[PDB]
Symmetry: D2
Subunit: 295 residues, 4 copies
């Protein structure tokens, strides 16, 4: 036998950092869950139980904290590039570091119509994530995403004209509820190193904001018979607004709401144009994906 | 052996309802999860295997849907009252209805600075709930609540002067992070029946909004040495703003964020004044509760 | 306003304890999650911000570890009585202690037909719990329980003869799947003190084993058209076999399996007597409870 | 812009199936959660909002139900293969079907020391899964796995000799608790079509029984200072025992149990050799992987 692939590190490292503005006294908090996986010349740990090549997972955790203490943790794309770069430069036998960061929302509270200097609320469970792969001699690859964004529109969605055969029972419809969770990823062009990433820093937060706004606006405004086409349109606009992006990927796990026929009860009318009360379904669910790139 | 207590019904009934304004075209959606439990003369189902006294759980489900179709589903206090009343008024052997409702947020989207007529976002996992007990001859009991409200203040919280003894290692502190999940319940005065609840409809959303606003503003502004104290201040204010409220109950699960000493690494300072990087702890957690009522002192 | 009730303490304290036999070399592990809430003369911490009456929740945590260190952690009924008593005896202004204990399963592995001395597997998410209320001057109240036990029987469950009116659509049946999670709780007669708890120590594990066995057997063997009667039969047998028990409470959250009609597709027969493939429903679910006492 | 990848289908389809023996009267239940994603000439649903190319996800659902009624649902490697093949044989424009199946446990109850004919218990949360890729003109790729298998060993685990630098605080140890959730996957050699898969049916269940037993035994008996070396010994045995397997992949998320220093309290000794009471840590956790192939 032979070790074809190996990775190891620390997962679920919860980090919090506070920034205190020295002029205004305003504090800003950042909270994230970090995962670091290392690759390199570590085969002997598996074949011979040689631990000499192993950077303990505990030390990896310590390094996460130390790195967050000495550097900016935002935007996460930078933080991840800093953390990943550290391991490949500090250890000669380590050739790739894979950093994954989940950012949690802490939104400043508005109290009496003014933003409070140090109180926050966890508004959504929506996350902002980055996946950063730092590979010796192949620069830095970054994938940025938003996830756990949950939306619903009560009309202006249709579904008709789909294939029909002996497996088909679904009726075509010209007015339905469209609800879905939204996972959107945008892959950056490969970066040559840390210096390049740092010089593109302003683009990260701005592109996250664009992807989020385009997603919301297109979803709300598009009167469509095809969820597939709505997602392609979201992706086209993001690619048009940010040249440094190579691809956009969407994954929409639909959430179904069924009409409830109540006619058996005093001929009560609750279907079609009369549909008022629906039954949200927990499962199963339609899942629709696409990865869009540049022609 | 005998049956001392019995209850049964349908749990986890998911319901959505949309309201459409013909005039404006504006649609409003509502979503919730409903549990209805029934009590009455039903011991025979246990003792003798007599199903003749049993209204099938499947039928309790249809009834929820039929009632949602025929009545306003908001405020939830109204709906649960309409729904529990139906059961004791339609089934002679049914003596009490316990209705639990969880309201999910579907908040209207603002697109390009304006409110969208029919798109919504789930802007938080915060819930608005009600527990309605409709008991034959004893009227309607209502507990209203908010839950899943998660907050953090990064400073202006202290904890010192507590009891110290041989089980104690906690150091006193004048500046710490205070984070918690808020659960607040306000118990209404008993209502005689449905018509009484109907007369007070407007107070329901109003008092939900006050309880929330009082919770946030107190948590943000209070410089308190005990969470116990901060919680008591919240309750006092809610009791003072709404007279139909008999008690306010708060339950606060503390979420700890520990300092991380990094001095073993070249003398790096990250504690006290110099603390910037913390470790949030998933468990264990402090848990603080209180039920606050009206005082019998006339002055 | 006035404080009507107040309680506070430490929740979610995870505890693991190992027992090592020096002769046999066999090891035994216990894992649980503990919650301790205290009551007493603590009003002024709410009303006057007076912390002098506050035993820090952090010191409650220390006390749990210290207590597990110096005492037996099994049966949890005993352990919880010890932990609750300690607080009302150590602090003058504390007059009630509420202890909740969740025990997790670590079942000894069997390797090559033989029980391994020190390897364990989590063989189920089923829990053994205790709730112990130690109230000064009023003894010790113990509720024991099992939860998270999920069962299913493929036939020999019926449901007919139920009330039918204009809100009914359910068709009666004489054959159906019965699946449910089981929550069973047995309330011990009040104990005057720790000495009395200590003298009945052997009764606890045995009653739990009895409660578990009675539950599975009756569930498996009963061919009933009433889940209510089935659980009433369960309670009777437990009450009969253990005199120190005052009440038995069952909570059965049903799990529905719907028949799927496929006759639109080539005359496929999959209903009634021909039903083979079912759709498990995630929600909603029937919920049935009862508390059974002695005449 | 161009569609670079696209896939869509139905997720979280819950399926239950009962097998009744008329002779013996003994029943056997299977329950699983299925996901089917399709790929093909479907770009136009995205670019042109053309649904005529869309096999409705609702019909994909129907199909999984009809397929389960008409065929054996065990072993899952077989069922997955039949279901994936169906799409590429029925539709001109679909060239790949990706089927994921998660099997849940329904273990036959032993009542009075005899197997019960129609009563089951969900012993563990452990799963047996399959991922089948059926791609037009490229055969059928099957990956089998077990997951959610949780184990603990109270001694006979060590960790010393790792790299130590200015980021390292972990002390070396010769006796510690080792606990993990296990995820093991084995990838079969490419199968040419359904008939060849059908020909190896017996091997599927047997290879799953083997991977499970090797994982438990090696974990229980190995006294290693390397989780890495233990997992490598596991993969070796599996590869040695099944020639039709190309690779074995293990993913082990460590679950740490910290020692609690209690000496500050009246000199209590609960460290090193006196350690009896530990604190289970929910996060963070080490995560170790490797993929082991043949030389």
């Amino acid at each position: 036998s032979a070790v074809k692939a190996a990775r190891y590190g620390k997962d679920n490292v919860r980090v919090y950092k506070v920034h205190k503005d020295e002029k205004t006294g305003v504090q800003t908090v950042y909270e994230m869950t970090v995962c670091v996986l290392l690759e390199g010349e570590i085969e002997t740990s598996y074949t011979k139980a040689d631990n000499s090549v192993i950077v303990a997972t505990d030390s990896i955790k310590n390094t996460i904290y130390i790195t967050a203490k000495q550097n900016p943790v935002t935007p996460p794309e930078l933080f991840g590039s800093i953390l990943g770069t550290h391991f490949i430069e500090k250890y000669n036998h380590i050739h790739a570091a894979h950093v994954n960061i989940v950012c949690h929302r802490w939104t400043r509270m508005d109290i009496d119509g003014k933003p409070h200097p140090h109180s926050f609320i966890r508004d959504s469970e929506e996350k902002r994530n980055v996946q950063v792969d730092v590979v010796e001699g192949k620069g830095i690859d970054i994938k940025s995403s938003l996830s756990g964004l949950t939306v619903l529109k009560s009309t202006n969605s249709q579904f008709w004209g789909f294939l029909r055969d002996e497996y088909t029972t679904l009726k075509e419809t010209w007015d339905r509820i469209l609800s879905t969770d939204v996972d959107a990823t945008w892959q950056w062009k490969n970066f040559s190193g840390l210096q390049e990433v740092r010089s593109h820093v302003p683009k990260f937060d701005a592109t996250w904001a664009t992807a989020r706004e385009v997603t919301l606006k297109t979803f709300a405004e598009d009167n469509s018979a095809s969820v597939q086409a709505t997602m392609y349109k979201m992706a086209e606009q993001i690619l048009a607004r940010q040249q440094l992006i190579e691809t956009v990927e969407y994954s929409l796990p639909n959430k179904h709401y069924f009409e409830i026929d109540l006619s058996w009860h005093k001929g009560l009318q609750n279907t079609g144009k009369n549909a008022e009360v629906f039954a949200p379904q927990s499962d199963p669910n339609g899942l629709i994906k696409c990865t869009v790139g540049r022609s």
